[PDB]
Amino acid sequence: NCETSCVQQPPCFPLKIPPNDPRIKNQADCIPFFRSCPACPGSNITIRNQINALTSFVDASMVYGSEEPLARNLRNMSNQLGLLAVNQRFQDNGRALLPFDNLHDDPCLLTNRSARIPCFLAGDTRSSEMPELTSMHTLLLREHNRLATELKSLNPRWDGERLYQEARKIVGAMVQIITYRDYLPLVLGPTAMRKYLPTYRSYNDSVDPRIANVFTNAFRYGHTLIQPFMFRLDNRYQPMEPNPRVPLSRVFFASWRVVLEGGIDPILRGLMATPAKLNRQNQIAVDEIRERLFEQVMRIGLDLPALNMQRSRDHGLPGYNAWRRFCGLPQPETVGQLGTVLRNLKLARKLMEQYGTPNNIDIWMGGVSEPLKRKGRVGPLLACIIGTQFRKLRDGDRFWWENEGVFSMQQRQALAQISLPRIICDNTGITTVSKNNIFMSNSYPRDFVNCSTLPALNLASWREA
Amino acid sequence: NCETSCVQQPPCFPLKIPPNDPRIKNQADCIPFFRSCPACPGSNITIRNQINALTSFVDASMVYGSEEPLARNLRNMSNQLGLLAVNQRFQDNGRALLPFDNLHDDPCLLTNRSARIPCFLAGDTRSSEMPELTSMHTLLLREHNRLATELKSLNPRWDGERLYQEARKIVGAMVQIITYRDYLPLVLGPTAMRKYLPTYRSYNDSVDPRIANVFTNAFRYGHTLIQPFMFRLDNRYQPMEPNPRVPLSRVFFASWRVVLEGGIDPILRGLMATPAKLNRQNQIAVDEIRERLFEQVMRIGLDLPALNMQRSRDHGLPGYNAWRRFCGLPQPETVGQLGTVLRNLKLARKLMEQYGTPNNIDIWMGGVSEPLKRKGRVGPLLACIIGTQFRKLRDGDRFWWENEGVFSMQQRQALAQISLPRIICDNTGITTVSKNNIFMSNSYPRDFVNCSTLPALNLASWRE
Amino acid sequence: ANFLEHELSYIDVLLDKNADQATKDNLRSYFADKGLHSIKDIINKAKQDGFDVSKYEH
Amino acid sequence: ANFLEHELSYIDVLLDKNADQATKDNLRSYFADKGLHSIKDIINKAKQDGFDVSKYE
Amino acid sequence: CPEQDKYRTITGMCNNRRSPTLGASNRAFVRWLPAEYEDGFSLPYGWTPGVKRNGFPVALARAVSNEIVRFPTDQLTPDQERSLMFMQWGQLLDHDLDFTPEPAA
Amino acid sequence: CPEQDKYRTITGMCNNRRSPTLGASNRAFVRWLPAEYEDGFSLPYGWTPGVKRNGFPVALARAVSNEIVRFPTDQLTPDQERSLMFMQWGQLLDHDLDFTPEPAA
Ligand SMILES: *[C@@H]1O[C@H](CO[C@@H]2O[C@@H](C)[C@@H](O)[C@@H](O)[C@@H]2O)[C@@H](O[C@@H]2O[C@H](CO)[C@@H](O[C@@H]3O[C@H](CO[C@H]4O[C@H](CO)[C@@H](O)[C@H](O)[C@@H]4O)[C@@H](O)[C@H](O)[C@@H]3O)[C@H](O)[C@H]2NC(C)=O)[C@H](O)[C@H]1NC(C)=O
Ligand SMILES: *[C@@H]1O[C@H](CO[C@@H]2O[C@@H](C)[C@@H](O)[C@@H](O)[C@@H]2O)[C@@H](O[C@@H]2O[C@H](CO)[C@@H](O[C@@H]3O[C@H](CO[C@H]4O[C@H](CO)[C@@H](O)[C@H](O)[C@@H]4O)[C@@H](O)[C@H](O)[C@@H]3O)[C@H](O)[C@H]2NC(C)=O)[C@H](O)[C@H]1NC(C)=O
Ligand code: HEM
Ligand code: HEM
Ligand SMILES: *[C@@H]1O[C@H](CO)[C@@H](O)[C@H](O)[C@H]1NC(C)=O
Ligand SMILES: *[C@@H]1O[C@H](CO)[C@@H](O)[C@H](O)[C@H]1NC(C)=O
Ligand SMILES: *[C@@H]1O[C@H](CO)[C@@H](O)[C@H](O)[C@H]1NC(C)=O
Ligand SMILES: *[C@@H]1O[C@H](CO)[C@@H](O)[C@H](O)[C@H]1NC(C)=O
Ligand SMILES: N#C[Se-]
Ligand SMILES: N#C[Se-]
Ligand SMILES: N#C[Se-]
Ligand SMILES: N#C[Se-]
Ligand SMILES: N#C[Se-]
Ligand SMILES: N#C[Se-]
Ligand SMILES: N#C[Se-]
Ligand SMILES: N#C[Se-]
Ligand SMILES: N#C[Se-]
Ligand SMILES: N#C[Se-]
Ligand SMILES: N#C[Se-]
Ligand SMILES: N#C[Se-]
Ligand SMILES: N#C[Se-]
Ligand SMILES: N#C[Se-]
């Protein structure tokens, strides 16, 4: 139905095509869209609401899975070493790749037909969507097995269950540290970080840790960071010939590229030594996602920004001004007031031409339109929403890594040494990595150091007598 | 079947009986209880929640109904006078009674069987539950018809629809004014009233006006105010013979008493000139509702306090301390701390004996245990919940009587003269009524005035 | 809807030979909103829900 | 439901004569949670979900 | 929702134009806190014999009523500053605000 | 929920002991504001031809993309102070937090 039909019948909500579209000349066509599953299907009484299929917590559930059967399928159950399952047919210069998934309709197979490389199996279903994503999944798989290995050597009496859990808990903590120490400050900027993420006191069981429906749309700010190519670099950080710069419309679900075009190392180097796209008010999102999203595996190229806005309507999200008010920010009524708020009268004029009032601006569009907080990559609205979400995820998490009783004070001192560059050194053939904060460092060789200069994670306080 | 069985099978959650019960010696018995209807029935995925069948707004929907078919059935459709329907078999010394409802199992018929007087029909289904309530329903019915009549005389061109709506809008405003000017300050006391209900600015469309689940339980603080009798008084405010003091367990669903034992005037006088029960920590709720609730119309006498506590569990309400924290109040962990919070170590010890921690204390039980705010009849916890609810109902109501555009500035000046005593004067045979605030005034003759001393509602600004 | 006792008085108005023509239309329309489309529908509903309608029979 | 390619390696362990008896029972237990109660059930599930199982005779 | 109107609807629908069910009849209550059920999502505390609430036995409602609420009704204290009309307006007001449906027979 | 435990569950169940579904998988999102649907409870804005939102036509999402989002991709501004790894961590992290399911065809 909704993949090939342009008829608007439940559960399909196709995006209609305007006159004089620059790409889709056929106005009878549409962009496919399935409405998100309701929590209470068929109900006349309830106000429709969507479902989160994952654990809201920062617990590396994209590695381990969010359901018990998946979680056991991701494990290596042929021994007691506490390992995650790895690809049995392919390796990456001797290292683990993710196992292959068995999908009824596998999009990855459609990218390179001769190659016949299916999508990967991971804690989350989207691991194959970009090879850059896949590389990060693969990195964390390896880091689990590395930690489990090291702990086995440290504690020979530990069984597979104990090893897996202890490794899992460490990976969880590493995701939390990189997120809150390194990543979020560069999203929010210092003012908003101080405001929304003040110093951790302790676990608070009255903080609701659920993902808010609005966050599912607000946190798509990152679509403005996307670069129209996948960049691959050799061990000298030079272009890996023959295809150093692949258009993104040729990497979506392209699992074969990880397996057959040289593994994760060239992709990770590209991630480290290429800039993100800057979000600017006149350069919101690139045509590889706006015009060609998933065009290799589907009848038509999607528009990710358009999908975001359709999705906010699907989810019943209030418009820009209601979220400004929620956040305690002024609500502009007029084009002139919106000009002040956006520091951009021209963009204000465009938004009012489309929407008629700032009350009706879709949250993503409004969010990403705001000028960026100093040293952040979102404006005040998105910083409020994103900041509030992540505060709830920290303070309402009983297993937050700093919470009394989760780690010993020695394990905490050890975990504070972790960094994403170190993880890359420990699990790839890469010997030169981003310095500093990895998320700011972007230029080889200026921003790079030898792996030997970086402190490893010392697991000695996980020794058990 | 939850009414007869003690088996715990959906949708039944019967209250089990402790050992050494002062009434129910048989531990194999139970107090009946049906779980409230789920919003999403059958669901694995959703967190269960209950349904409000009424409009949250203070809009007199207990007079007019909350669904369109009932609203039509309550109206007099035989003319264009814009009236609510009245009883066609009985009157009260010449005045309107509520029409009778047609229930397939009518509990009111079971009170006095020889009398054969069924339950009344009103905007809300519980109008017959005690005759004092019925009297207030009847008063508002009359007030509507009186207003509709007066407006017809003022505006002869107005059709039935216009008359009904204009009267309805007035009655809505009168319920709002009585509630917020006279009633709620005596619940909350001055400090909490200022805190939770500061002076109205304007309608705010971002204030969610829904009833919160917890308010359905918290607002049952009023069960502590209930007296074990219905009091009836003659026109000299003396006992109305032969039965001036009926036990409550003989008035539940006793619609016949309104019809046949002399109408609403004796009941309203009793309401005006009798004190409420005080909630005290050692005297929380009376045995007429704790032991004999609805015993005339059911296999066993219910326990209204116990129902409240069972109902909060049915609704998945958090316990006392979670609500204290929500409200920004200290959360006592120990029996000593709970003693400080209650000014009552003995009650604290009893609560901890039953519940084990103040985290688990059921919201009603905890709420009504707290000492009362100065000049209020709830403690801080209930004051927060109740005050917060009523602020939302005011500020999130587009038809709030003070909101720009609902009434003219002249209609507002006129409505400000309304009072509940005036409404009683205008729609009963009573000529002497409570002074002051009706809700404080409780002693004849000290607290009473002649009806002629009270300012009427002037409808001149409704002319057209 | 169960038939209501006060709705018996409407059957009287519809039968009052000298009742206003518009007034009868008001009530005809009211019973039609319920799915009662004749006076036979009205009086048979009143029978089943408990009330005596033989007192009207012409 | 679907049999996963890496689970083919477990079929090898269950057939390895020299594989530890505890090791086989932990895999037998894993497949029992998925409704596969013999090695014949495991191999037949792998066949139906698309894998070459001809190497098991 | 009509862009202009003059009177309240009967159901309460359209009072709030941006979210028109808000305060309307036959809708779910809003929750001010997350719900607390025995099973997380459905079963009330006291449903399953032996299941504790937050580390403590669930107290029978009737037991709590017996030990806390019961008093000799001869001890009743009248309120000097409140009429019985004060309780009755509460109940009538309650009946403007909330009725929670149950199944019948 | 066990009274003592050492590791997270897989589902997130029992993280919050008083309300054990909170943050667990396969549960409804929390809403920070009331939902805004064309019909109050279900239908998205833009569903029914001619139905306005708050007195204004609903804009085709693709038109908003065309008029506001599109830009000549070769004029892209690189971010001097962010690596592409900064975007990639965001997507990976998002995949720790939320996946909203849709019906299978
Ligand atoms: C119209 O009314 C709304 C609603 O007002 C609330 O209810 C009424 C009855 C009164 O009690 C008010 O005092 C209430 O605020 C007002 O909007 C609210 O404004 C406040 C102040 O700007 C907003 O509070 C902010 O919220 C930010 C976001 O976090 C909040 O929500 C999260 C998620 O649940 C929660 O974890 C957190 O604790 C916050 O509550 C926060 O960053 C900031 O510090 C501050 O708390 C509030 O969110 C607004 N609510 C809504 C629904 O929009 C309007 O101001 C008012 N306007 C006028 C002119 O009166
Ligand atoms: C543990 O954390 C909770 C929750 O804290 C919130 O979220 C975390 C992530 C932080 O961001 C906090 O800033 C947030 O407040 C704390 O409990 C809360 O405490 C505050 C202050 O005491 C409570 O707020 C009060 O709320 C009263 C009731 O009205 C509120 O709700 C209605 C309806 O939703 C709304 O309309 C109104 O505007 C309010 O939001 C209000 O009368 C009073 O003035 C005050 O605002 C809040 O409600 C509490 N929430 C909960 C879930 O309990 C704890 O204090 C904290 N304890 C620690 C760290 O020890
Ligand atoms: C004569 C006076 C009163 C009663 C008789 C009476 C009885 C009940 C009953 C049976 C319930 C339901 C119990 C259950 O959980 O099954 C009930 C609930 C509510 N009350 Fe009661 N009540 C009388 C008097 C008052 C007064 C004075 C109140 C307030 C000031 C008051 C409040 C309420 C409320 C709000 C409810 C819940 C309503 C709902 O269905 O949502 N009552 N009462
Ligand atoms: C690297 C490439 C990225 C994509 C390709 C991609 C694509 C999507 C798609 C297709 C959706 C669903 C659209 C719809 O509504 O139908 C989507 C949603 C979400 N994004 Fe995407 N995204 C890519 C990259 C990022 C980055 C860098 C993000 C953030 C920093 C980011 C966020 C999100 C989020 C949170 C969602 C919603 C998830 C959910 O289902 O709850 N994405 N993205
Ligand atoms: C399990 O671990 C062993 C030892 O590392 C390895 O040879 C085997 O392939 C693994 N099985 C998986 C990952 O499915
Ligand atoms: C597809 O994969 C094949 C085999 O792995 C490879 O040689 C080829 O260059 C790839 N490119 C195509 C055809 O897109
Ligand atoms: C309708 O009003 C008229 C005039 O007041 C009266 O005679 C009649 O009894 C009323 N009928 C009902 C059902 O209230
Ligand atoms: C029952 O009702 C009749 C009215 O028909 C009345 O005479 C009688 O006194 C009532 N009985 C009681 C118990 O009061
Ligand atoms: N599901 C729907 Se429209
Ligand atoms: N190309 C363009 Se507008
Ligand atoms: N889902 C619900 Se209310
Ligand atoms: N080979 C494999 Se998964
Ligand atoms: N790239 C490819 Se087919
Ligand atoms: N990422 C995705 Se669909
Ligand atoms: N696994 C363990 Se304790
Ligand atoms: N350091 C940290 Se979150
Ligand atoms: N703290 C910071 Se950027
Ligand atoms: N593929 C490429 Se350039
Ligand atoms: N689509 C392709 Se090559
Ligand atoms: N979508 C597809 Se074909
Ligand atoms: N609001 C504003 Se300028
Ligand atoms: N438009 C803009 Se910049």
Ligand SMILES: N#C[Se-]
């Ligand atoms: N490094 C590895 Se597998």
Ligand SMILES: N#C[Se-]
């Ligand atoms: N309904 C129930 Se348990």
Ligand SMILES: N#C[Se-]
């Ligand atoms: N009031 C009652 Se049931």
Ligand SMILES: N#C[Se-]
């Ligand atoms: N205007 C009217 Se009813």
Ligand SMILES: N#C[Se-]
């Ligand atoms: N506030 C009042 Se009437």
Ligand SMILES: N#C[Se-]
């Ligand atoms: N005794 C009396 Se009212």
Ligand SMILES: N#C[Se-]
């Ligand atoms: N109950 C007491 Se003190």
Ligand SMILES: N#C[Se-]
């Ligand atoms: N004392 C105390 Se909370």
Ligand SMILES: N#C[Se-]
């Ligand atoms: N604090 C108190 Se009740």
Ligand SMILES: N#C[Se-]
């Ligand atoms: N024992 C007691 Se409450």
Ligand SMILES: N#C[Se-]
């Ligand atoms: N409080 C007193 Se008098």
Ligand SMILES: N#C[Se-]
């Ligand atoms: N209330 C008093 Se005094």
Ligand SMILES: N#C[Se-]
């Ligand atoms: N008698 C009557 Se409705």
Ligand SMILES: N#C[Se-]
């Ligand atoms: N109100 C509540 Se949970």
Ligand SMILES: N#C[Se-]
């Ligand atoms: N937990 C909840 Se709504």
Ligand SMILES: N#C[Se-]
């Ligand atoms: N979150 C929301 Se509406």
